[PDB]
Design a protein around this ligand. Structure first.
Ligand code: HEM
Length: 429
């Protein structure tokens, strides 16, 4: 019985649909839903990906236990990179402080901005998010010993996630080589901070905690190599997502001056009570929030969510087998026509009380995913954007220095990022 799941057209290239997935993954995924519907597959090298879409299919996907759809082995490119977080830095009691930390990191970042100038959205926000994450999730003391170097290396790590990892995480290609060398540079970086603390024993941070943990032998339990990895781990899920979202929030505001105007008036109005960013970032900021939600629907940082099937299951009559990669796609589900009218349109109103399309499509509006394993950093990420823009939009006004269309994502790697250049002009309000 040579029966198989329905497969999307194409896949002609050497590694099937891989070549396409590295160029236009969203187009490939839309063609799957368009030709096959809710359940369809495409081939990534040797592996088959079972792409689920639509409310019913996604519900099955998100309500499944880690015993059915495991995430652990779904992203082999993470092994070389790495080599819970919630308890350490995401406790609600900590949000207020993180709001202040973030505000401080932003003001520090733009400190040399002056009157007017230009920045690159990817460069600015990517580095800014390294500082906010490192400062909040690990500690300011640690962040203060970091600079553009750490950021540049961390970026090489993210550019080391070419879909070819599904063939082998250690292929002798350039991106995988750069990835390994970059991590080697991150260890040298962390080791230097570690030796400074040991040679010269106060506010304590997560690095202090990891350095102090002793093995039963009495010897320290973690090496510089292991600490760097854990640190890379703590910041990975929150870095490229925040950087990208921040970039696309400013891009959309700039593309739609009407939304920009509204956000600005509301911020000046909100802050008119004299309270701080750490006070307002934890509280409602409607216009800004709806622009954010609309930015996440149109440009979700994770365009595909992966899993490895453990058992034998059936989704809408189609049979999934153990070993199959099962996948959900926020890029695709977030634009399903019947759930989000004019899906390709930037319509913040979509989330105002009268519609709240985000809450009426619990299994389709999945920029943060859904179910039990819905992004645990969601509240932090929202607070961060509020905190970041409360500072930027009040101090500076922005404008595009390139055609509106040239602002787009780079889909060559599993981790999505803004293509360059992404130049933007700024000027003090
Ligand atoms: C607005 C920016 C962000 C977006 C769109 C986002 C989105 C997501 C999505 C879609 C998932 C689920 C992935 C899957 O189902 O395979 C996820 C998981 C996760 N995110 Fe985020 N995230 C963002 C920011 C952050 C930040 C800033 C942090 C760190 C404070 C973070 C930490 C995590 C963690 C730890 C998980 C794993 C959750 C679990 O499996 O239980 N995220 N995120």
């Amino acid at each position: 019985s040579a029966v198989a799941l329905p497969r999307v057209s194409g896949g002609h290239d050497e590694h099937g649909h891989l070549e396409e997935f590295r160029t236009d993954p969203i187009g490939l995924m839309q063609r799957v839903r368009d030709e096959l519907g809710d359940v369809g597959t495409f081939q990534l090298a040797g592996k088959q990906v079972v792409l689920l879409s639509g409310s019913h299919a996604n519900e099955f996907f998100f309500r499944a236990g880690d015993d059915d759809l495991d995430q652990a082995k779904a992203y082999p490119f993470m092994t070389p990179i790495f080599g819970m977080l919630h308890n350490a830095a995401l406790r609600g009691e900590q949000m207020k402080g993180h709001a202040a930390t973030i505000e401080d990191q932003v003001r520090r970042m733009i400190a040399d901005w002056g009157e007017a100038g230009e920045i690159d959205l990817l460069d600015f926000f990517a580095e800014l998010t390294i500082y906010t994450s490192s400062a909040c999730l690990i500690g300011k003391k640690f962040r203060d010993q970091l600079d553009g170097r750490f950021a540049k290396l961390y970026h090489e790590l993210e550019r080391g996630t070419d879909p070819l990892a599904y063939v082998d995480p250690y292929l002798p290609i350039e991106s995988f080589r750069r990835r390994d060398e970059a991590r080697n540079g991150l260890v040298a970086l962390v080791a230097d901070i570690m030796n400074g603390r040991i040679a010269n024993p106060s506010d304590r941070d997560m690095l202090d905690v990891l350095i102090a943990v002793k093995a039963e032998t009495g010897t320290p339990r973690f090496s510089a190599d292991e600490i760097t990895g854990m640190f890379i781990s703590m910041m990975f899920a929150g870095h490229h997502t925040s950087s990208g979202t921040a970039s696309w929030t400013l891009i959309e505001l700039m593309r739609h001056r009407d939304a920009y105007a509204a956000v600005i008036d509301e911020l000046d109005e909100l802050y008119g009570d004299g309270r701080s960013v750490s006070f307002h970032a934890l509280r409602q900021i409607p216009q800004l929030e709806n622009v954010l939600k609309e930015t996440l629907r149109l440009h979700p940082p994770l365009i595909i969510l992966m899993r490895v099937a453990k058992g034998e299951f059936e989704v809408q009559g189609h049979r999934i087998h153990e070993g199959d990669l099962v996948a959900a796609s926020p890029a695709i589900s977030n634009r399903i026509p019947e759930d989000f009218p004019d899906p390709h349109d930037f319509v913040p109103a979509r989330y105002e009380q009268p519609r709240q399309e985000d809450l009426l499509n619990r299994w389709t509006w999945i920029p943060f995913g859904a179910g039990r394993h819905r992004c645990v950093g969601a509240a932090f990420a929202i607070m961060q954007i509020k905190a970041i823009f409360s500072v930027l939009l009040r101090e500076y006004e922005f404008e595009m220095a390139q055609p509106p269309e040239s602002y787009r994502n780079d889909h060559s790697k599993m981790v999505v990022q803004l293509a360059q250049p992404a130049a933007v002009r700024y000027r003090r309000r």
